[PDB]
Structure 1
Amino acid sequence: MVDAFLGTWKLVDSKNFDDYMKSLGVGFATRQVASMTKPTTIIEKNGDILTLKTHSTFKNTEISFKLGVEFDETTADDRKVKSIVTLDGGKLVHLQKWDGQETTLVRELIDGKLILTLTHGTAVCTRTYEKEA
Structure 2
Amino acid sequence: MVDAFLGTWKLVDSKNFDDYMKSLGVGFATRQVASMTKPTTIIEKNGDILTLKTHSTFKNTEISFKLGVEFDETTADDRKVKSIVTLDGGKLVHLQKWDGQETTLVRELIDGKLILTLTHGTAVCTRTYEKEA
TM-score using structure 2 length = 1.00
In the TM superposition, what is the alpha-carbon distance from 1:6 to its structure 2 partner?
0.0
| 1:78 positional shift | 0.1
Q: Output one character per residue of 1:83-113: Cα deviation in whole Å (capped at 9) or x when no partner.
A: 0000000000000000000000000000000
CA distance in 2, matches of 1:99, 1:26: 16
- Measure, in 2, the Cα distance between the counterparts of 1:30 and 1:98: 21
For structure 1, the 5+ residue unaligned runs are: none
Quote the offset at 1:118 in angstroms: 0.0
1:60 is displaced (CA, Å) by 0.1
CA distance in 2, matches of 1:17, 1:42: 20
Size of the alignment, in residue pairs? 133
Q: Deviations over 1:24-61 (max 9, x none)?
A: 00000000000000000000000000000000000000
Partners of 1:61 and 1:32 in 2: how far apart? 19
Structure 2 segments unaligned to the other structure (5+ residues): none
Q: Runs of at least 4 residues of structure 1 off by over 4 A?
A: none
1:64 is displaced (CA, Å) by 0.1
TM, length-normalised to structure 1: 1.00
